[PDB]
Design a binder for this molecule. Sequence first.
Ligand SMILES: *[C@@H]1O[C@H](CO[C@@H]2O[C@@H](C)[C@@H](O)[C@@H](O)[C@@H]2O)[C@@H](O[C@@H]2O[C@H](CO)[C@@H](O[C@@H]3O[C@H](CO)[C@@H](O)[C@H](O)[C@@H]3O)[C@H](O)[C@H]2NC(C)=O)[C@H](O)[C@H]1NC(C)=O
Lengths: 212, 108, 108, 195, 119, 120, 228
Amino acid sequence: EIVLTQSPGTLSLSPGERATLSCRASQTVSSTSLAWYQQKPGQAPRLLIYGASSRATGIPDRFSGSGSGTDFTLTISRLEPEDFAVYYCQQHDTSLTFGGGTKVEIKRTVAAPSVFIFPPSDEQLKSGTASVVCLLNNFYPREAKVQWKVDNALQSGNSQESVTEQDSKDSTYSLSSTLTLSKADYEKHKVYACEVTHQGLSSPVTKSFNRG
Amino acid sequence: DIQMTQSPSSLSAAVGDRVTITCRASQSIGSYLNWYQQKPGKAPKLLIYAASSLQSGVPSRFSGSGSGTDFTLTISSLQPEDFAIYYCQQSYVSPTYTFGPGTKVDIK
Amino acid sequence: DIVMTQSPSSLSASVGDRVTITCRASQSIAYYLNWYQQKPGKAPKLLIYAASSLQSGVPSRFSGSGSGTDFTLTISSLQPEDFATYYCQQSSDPPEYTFGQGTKLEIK
Amino acid sequence: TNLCPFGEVFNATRFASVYAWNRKRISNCVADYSVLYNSASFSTFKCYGVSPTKLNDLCFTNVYADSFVIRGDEVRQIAPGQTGKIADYNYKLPDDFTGCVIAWNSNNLDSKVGGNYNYLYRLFRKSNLKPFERDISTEIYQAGSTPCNGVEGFNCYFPLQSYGFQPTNGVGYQPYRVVVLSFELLHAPATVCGP
Amino acid sequence: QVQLVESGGGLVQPGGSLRLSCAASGFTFSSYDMHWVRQTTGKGLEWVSTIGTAGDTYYPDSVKGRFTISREDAKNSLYLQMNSLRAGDTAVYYCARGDSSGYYYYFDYWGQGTLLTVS
Amino acid sequence: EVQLVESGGGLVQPGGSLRLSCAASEFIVSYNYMSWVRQAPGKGLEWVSVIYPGGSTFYADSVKGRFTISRDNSMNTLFLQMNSLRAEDTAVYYCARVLPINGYYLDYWGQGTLVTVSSA
Amino acid sequence: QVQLVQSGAEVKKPGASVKVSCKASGYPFTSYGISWVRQAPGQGLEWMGWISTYNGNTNYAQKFQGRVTMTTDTSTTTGYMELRRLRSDDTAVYYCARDYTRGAWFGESLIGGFDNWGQGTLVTVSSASTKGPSVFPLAPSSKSTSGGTAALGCLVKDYFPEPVTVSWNSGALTSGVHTFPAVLQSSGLYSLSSVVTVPSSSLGTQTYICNVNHKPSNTKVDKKVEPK
Ligand SMILES: *[C@@H]1O[C@H](CO[C@@H]2O[C@@H](C)[C@@H](O)[C@@H](O)[C@@H]2O)[C@@H](O[C@@H]2O[C@H](CO)[C@@H](O[C@@H]3O[C@H](CO)[C@@H](O)[C@H](O)[C@@H]3O)[C@H](O)[C@H]2NC(C)=O)[C@H](O)[C@H]1NC(C)=O
């Protein structure tokens, strides 16, 4: 079947600019069988362009589409604050398929996350489960890396991280992490450190706290 | 478009005579035809529709017959107020209705 | 409707040369144009159809190309038997196809 | 109740060729022509035997939708009492025809760079087509005494030819999607009224 | 009775714009179609516009893109807006009422007319 | 063998009527597009009429309403009927076959017959 | 005024089946079909099938060719999708859309797309039982850095249903509060954290308590956060 690939995966731009997106197909697709969709977070998708050149009902004049053959393009003249969401393309020339999706984000200058650390609570020792959180403060670039340092030995495959949405107040992100350990191994360890690597930080900021 | 032609161009008849106006169509139009009378310096008036039906108020002296590409309008007796220019119209192709050229009846 | 014009009305070439005959049109007729060879006193012969094809049996020295409102015909080598009159026909319209004024050819 | 599917006839992705023209039977529905009243995209809208108005106050038995793609210069042949290649060998309408003909330019949908050769029409035929008759045979046409026996050659031709649509041609040569609606009224009770 | 009175025509320069009107009486204006017909001595009667009950407007190829027909049932006024006038539009314009008896169509009542001259 | 022999020329008075014939060999006049082209002395070729295999007929404006093209399947002959001849109809008439394969082109021709209309 | 309303979220054990509903109003029901598309959490859109509301024809996807069935009730103008043999990787958000890609009467392709959508239904298929959240406070460190800037939060762990609500100071505070999305654990439960940044100058004077609301278990546990 026809496979639709959308590039680039992410596109960061500042409001007032213009946006260009690509939806590429493996075979030849008729212009009569292409459509575009926009999905704001927490909401159902809405139709933008049908037939690759026709605007839907209630769609402002900003959104325009053109293209034929195996390549198609969506064009946005101006980026309003409510025009930042994920976009998909579909085809029904041969069965029905969807694309990967392109995300549009607000662009901001580089910031620096303020790294914090929290020792395990007392009740977790009673419950026999160890959890330590390496909280991160505001920072713009999504691409960031964290790593738990235990004494002199690193850890892998025993942690998971979550990231919040881009807040409209300051266009910054927040990150969280948690190292999974038990009471049988928390007491054995001596030094707990959290390693942070980012563009906003000139050098890694590895805060730590002693055992107990 | 369907072109309508009339003959004769000019007709002269006296009071109480018999007249014949012929309307020919460039294509078969069946029984879709109308007839109009226009006295000078006035508005056209409707006489016959469907090529054989008499409009209410029109005098009984008028009649229509024909189908296809030949049509005829006949006045049994020519009253003094029946001198005017007569037009035939086709109602088969819509909305672009077409009219005839016109035939004039005078008094000799 | 469409009016076609050839150019020039006459032409000349000695031997073993190249010629060029152009036949324009008042409107674009896509690639529908034909070329004929009419020797004196007898019927013409078809050379090129659709402005680019070659009729079976035609010598390969004849060639033509063009589209829209401009067309041309070229003879690579002028053999002694190539002196005749040539015409362009507009095959675009199915029912009504017209000719040009023609273009003779002669020795110098 | 059910509304007639005029959108499926008009807003379909693929249209059939002229020689193998498509026909759809519409019945048991209310027909709404407000979709046709104002569209601003139709180049041809002619109704024969009934006004474009009064269509919403008329009841019919069956409605047929015929759709195909032809060039602009051949749209005038889709009309009663016409002669030509399309009228005589591909699609024929009766002299006493009650229906409407709608056409619009589809140059942005049925024309591709390098030429689209998916639409065909018939060149040769022995006899003229009767009204509402469909011919799809592909037997080799014989124009001479010698039997063809399937060996194509001189005086033995294939009866179908391709349109070859290009985006740079004139409006006469550009493709047009034509929809022909035929209304038949018989002794059967009316099924399509559309109040 | 049924009457139709036109008004709003006169002299006008080429390329200009003008708007006519045709008041009605004696019938339900919203229940009937309305047409405009011209008459030139060299070409006879000719149909130039038609408006339906459901907002549909039909134009010939001669005046399409230049003439706009409007209907206002509350005021019982039928209008005709003309743009890009040429010297070929000098004729007497009538407003007619269209009625049908079955599948057959005809123009039943006409107005006095209004002369328009292009100079 | 493929041939098209023409006959029927002569001298006629203005307002007269003449009939031209054009037989065929290896052809079937009722199966092929056929056309008439006339060439006045010292002038270019001009199309006159064309008949379709189904039976349709088309004429030029200059000769519309006066000429008629017909055929006989039994004799395999193509006819041209000329009426109300004027002084401008003096030309040599050709019968040709037309192939609508890639446009309309006239592949096979005949030899032509002279038709002269003069007051003498 | 064209609106489609779906049913609420559901939780099912593996091996069962779930039937979703989609009520439609404001348009001729028989002139448009209904299409279903589902979206995995954090992934893209995946097509399921199309149904016709005039004849009843269905065109399912090849992946779901065996274990899906769709029905439409003309009287109530409601469409249904039933998915059988539920799996672990079938947790997603299911959407209902009015279709303009395939005709209802004839079944041919059309120029358009899915013009209208619905809110969506959240379906969870996990082999676990309902468990109440447990709250562990996260007190700030003894030292203060970049005063006045201090952060504190409470950790929520071991709760099966996804939706929970966390508020600080009974909702009095609404500035500088971040709540992290839940992350699935290997055990099968969820863990969520909410952090708030406050000036270090008034850390001792201002006391805050995080509150956790868990509707499925009807459990509300409030624990104040203080240094040590
Ligand atoms: C073929 O399809 C077009 C548009 O495509 C369709 O548009 C919507 C109706 C949705 O179904 C889409 O999923 C689908 O792609 C039809 O044209 C549209 O018709 C409607 C109804 O007549 C028009 O709505 C009007 O909007 C104006 C305001 O602009 C209102 O004042 C009217 O009262 C009415 O609501 C719509 O504008 C029009 N759009 C375009 C671009 O033309 C078209 O009717 C259809 N063909 C057939 C035969 O149904």
